Ligand binder design. Structure first.
Ligand SMILES: *O([C]1[C]([O])[C]([C]OP([O])(=O)OP(=O)([O-])O[C][C]2O[C]([N+]3=[C][C]=[C]C(C([N])=O)=[C]3)[C]([O])[C]2[O])O[C]1N1[C]=NC2=C1N=[C]N=C2[N])P([O])([O])=O
Ligand SMILES: *O([C]1[C]([O])[C]([C]OP([O])(=O)OP(=O)([O-])O[C][C]2O[C]([N+]3=[C][C]=[C]C(C([N])=O)=[C]3)[C]([O])[C]2[O])O[C]1N1[C]=NC2=C1N=[C]N=C2[N])P([O])([O])=O
Lengths: 364, 193, 364
């Protein structure tokens, strides 16, 4: 039998306070026909995961005694990469050694193992399978473990709402160094959209700007430049010279930053708000709505794909193909290996606390 | 003021400008390693390095005007190897009675000059072709070459660096050159022996 | 010849500072075939007219010497009611005695007379024509002079953007005692839309509440109640028990008030911002966009109807019909009759100064 551990909470709050590790047992001998057991290869810490734990994200798993606690508890994490270790007698879509991701949210990916059904999972090609097919590249663990939220989010925001004319039109985004922002810059490059990334200034600005341009950002500006009345006409010129328009803003910051990117749109522009930095509302001057016909809207990948498996599959296959073809690289993760030096939940707690360092991936 | 600032010719112009005490502006295409390139060109002798986006910019024009005013001098000469909008931008930056020499066309785009520069600023646009200039001008060729040799011997000039590919007999010579043609974008290519 | 008076400015600024009166001559004995001469019956002072003079509203008349000034000058006012006094040999659309409003903005209505072309004007029925047509009511001067902005605004926001199911669905608005707010309540009654109006508290609150409910508001709440965490669930119940959904919000306030009305929409709601209460940006929490799929957009009647004659015409006709039928009521204007004993521009300067007293209509 398999001894596993899960990161759980029984009450919503800050991960530093409410998270603990639970050891539980999975019966790999007593397997129903449609069942599948998997081992975790890695799972990332996303803001949505943290928000879910904090109680401010209206999509979460039920609390239960299933993991062997007296007090009903919930698992953590919504995306991750798993290896199929054993399948039941009536499962034909998966087999031992296959790579998979959860087919749905609320699965619990901050744990070592899981028992579910075959339809709780989606097959991604493992590296041996990509090589056996004809592909020049196989997916890394980080690439597989982070494929389902951030790359889909960037792709869908850029393609599903307004049509940007390849080779002329523009989008603008804040949180430019975020994982989603990095995917959006690369996808923009791949699809021949022009882009402006807005980032916070820092001593190594030079380095950070260069990295983002290499990914595909056409221009990178600081939040000081975003705020500047003086700088505004320079942005207007960039857009005018291309022959296109800035039609789309992507906002994950809110506050002054959101105002700034909205202002840089041509008339009839659309903003999509997909995130927000801690107690800071989307603020838009009345004039943009009235005189520029600005529209401010939302984006939630969970909700958009809940009842749309075709859109999901299709978006997912493109990301996979681009990875295999070597056209897309991953937003890099700081990888922490669960090797027994420190318990599981502290790895995730450290991960949450070190979020500012960049995207965090726990590996197994 | 010159465009194609990262070209081998652009790099010699920057150095010769420094050696003769001329101020210069190099215009270059934006790139991820922009800062490193700007630094290289300034070290060579460019006084200022701007991007083609800055070249296009009405907003930025007055900043360039400030530089020139502070120097006490005038922008009298433009060197164009790009054509199109780039040629427009560098022409606009000249003081009245300016001259542009077009010596190349690195996109197929024609030399494009606003009517107002000709009529109101007395701009003149002409060509340059070293082969034709030196055809019956062997004294001028010799004098120019001697200066370049002397500068190299004195340590005052350096070369626009090449990516070197050595011929050794295992790959046909024409393929080395074909690869060199295809890798033009990486920078000046030299087949060695 | 006709001696006319026009209120002009040569430079943008505060109306108290830059307005003057110019005397000019109209040659009524030399009309070109398509030309028409009109005499003003009344024109109102709207915030847009003031903003226009201030130079902060991006739709304005050219500055010209055509009123006989040496300095290029602009006329003032964008709506008003006029009477046709003479037409050119080829005019069939209008006749002496007809009532007209400008067919387009920037015509200049703060003046005694105008010379234009027939297509510079839209015919409304004069009371003699409404009566001859068997209607119970002719239009008042105020109703005609104020028909072009505020009533059309209310009607178009309510019908042109999202379809409210009559007898079920809801809109919510702030500025509930504003002119547009009061028209919106009546139109909701006429079209069988449920509504909540949000108003500022005042000593005669219960009285104002009864008056708005009579106009057509289903429920009226204060800004304190709009802000109230405690009160929110009560509103949810109203909508739930009705069988419909709160699909549309109308915002003319910004700030906390806009946040409050947006929070009270069902999922997939739309807000239209059509005005602003000095300095206050439209403030919306990130969570509404992401988790409620909220959308924030603009409304500007001038732009919407700029090149949509058919939509204007149809909307105008409905407003006229309702006035003739006694089914729509205007708020009373404070009317100031131009005498010749006091410069015309001073009448409008006073009107600008006395704006909070109520809508100012200068009459002739
Ligand atoms: O700036 C900070 C980073 O750029 C950024 C955080 O980056 P990240 O890689 O850890 O987070 P990501 O996984 O990329 O995405 C997180 C944000 O997007 C939302 N999201 C993502 C995917 C899908 C959904 C959806 N709606 O479908 C949503 C998520 O809620 C997150 O908001 O943030 C930057 N940062 C941090 N604090 C900031 C700030 N920017 C401005 N102001 C403040 N306060 P760096 O590089 O550190 O300077
Ligand atoms: O921008 C490109 C480079 O700056 C530049 C090319 O650089 P190079 O070193 O490979 O070429 P050089 O050997 O220096 O000379 C090239 C041009 O000059 C002409 N020429 C040279 C000598 C003598 C004569 C003459 N008439 O006597 C002429 C020659 O014909 C060439 O035209 O080009 C830049 N580039 C490339 N594509 C561009 C562009 N600029 C703008 N737009 C486009 N599309 P990088 O550094 O790659 O960004």
């Amino acid at each position: 039998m398999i001894t596993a551990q899960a990161v759980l909470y029984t009450q919503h709050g800050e991960p530093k306070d409410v998270l603990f590790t639970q050891s539980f047992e999975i019966d790999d001998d007593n397997l129903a026909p449609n069942e599948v057991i998997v081992k975790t290869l890695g799972s990332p810490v996303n803001p949505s995961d943290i928000n879910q734990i904090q109680g401010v994200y209206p999509s979460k798993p039920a609390k239960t005694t299933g993991f062997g606690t007296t007090e009903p508890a919930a698992p953590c994490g919504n995306e991750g990469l798993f290896e199929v270790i054993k399948v039941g007698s009536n499962v034909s879509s998966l087999e031992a050694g296959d790579w998979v991701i959860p087919s749905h949210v609320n699965f619990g990916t901050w744990r070592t193992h899981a028992l579910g059904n075959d339809d709780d999972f989606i097959k991604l090609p493992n590296p041996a399978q990509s090589k056996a097919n004809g592909k020049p590249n196989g997916l890394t663990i980080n690439q597989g473990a982070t494929i389902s939220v951030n790359p889909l989010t960037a792709y869908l925001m850029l393609t599903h709402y307004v049509k940007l004319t390849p080779g002329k039109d523009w989008f603008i985004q804040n949180g430019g160094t975020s994982a989603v922002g990095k995917y959006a810059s690369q996808i923009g490059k791949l699809l021949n959209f022009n882009s402006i990334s807005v980032i916070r200034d820092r001593p190594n600005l030079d380095e950070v700007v260069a990295s983002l341009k290499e990914l595909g950002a056409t221009q990178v500006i600081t939040e000081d430049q975003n705020n500047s009345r003086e700088f505004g006409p320079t942005i207007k010129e960039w857009i005018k010279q291309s022959g296109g328009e800035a039609k789309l803003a992507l906002n994950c910051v809110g506050g002054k930053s959101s105002t700034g990117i909205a202002r840089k749109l041509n008339n009839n522009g659309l903003m999509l708000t997909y995130g927000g930095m801690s107690f800071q509302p989307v603020t838009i001057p009345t004039s943009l709505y009235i005189f520029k016909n600005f529209t401010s809207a939302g984006f939630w990948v969970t909700e958009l794909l809940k009842n749309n498996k075709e859109l999901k599959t299709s978006t997912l296959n493109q990301i996979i193909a681009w990875y295999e073809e070597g056209k897309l690289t991953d937003a890099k993760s700081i990888e922490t290996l669960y090797d027994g030096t420190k318990p599981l939940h502290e790895l995730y707690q450290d991960g949450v606390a070190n979020s500012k360092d960049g995207k965090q991936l726990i590996t197994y | 003021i010159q465009n194609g600032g990262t070209s081998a010719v652009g790099k010699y112009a920057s150095q010769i400008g420094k050696l003769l005490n001329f101020n210069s502006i190099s215009v270059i295409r934006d790139r991820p390693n922009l800062d490193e390139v700007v630094a290289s060109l300034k070290e060579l002798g460019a006084t200022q390095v701007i991007t083609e986006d800055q070249n296009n910019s009405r907003e930025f024009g007055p900043t360039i005007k400030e530089w020139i005013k502070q120097s006490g001098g005038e922008a009298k000469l433009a060197l164009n190897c790009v054509g199109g909008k780039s040629s427009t931008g560098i022409a606009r930056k000249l003081n009245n009675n300016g001259l542009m020499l077009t010596y190349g066309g690195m996109s197929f785009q024609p030399v494009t000059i606003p009517t107002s520069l000709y009529i109101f600023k007395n701009f003149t646009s002409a060509g340059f072709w070293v082969t034709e200039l030196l055809k019956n001008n062997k004294e001028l060729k010799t004098s120019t070459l001697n200066q370049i040799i002397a500068w190299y011997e004195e340590g005052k000039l350096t070369d626009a660096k090449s990516i070197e590919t050595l011929y050794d007999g295992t790959k046909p010579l024409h393929e080395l050159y074909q690869d060199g043609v295809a890798n033009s974008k990486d920078g000046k290519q030299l087949i060695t022996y």
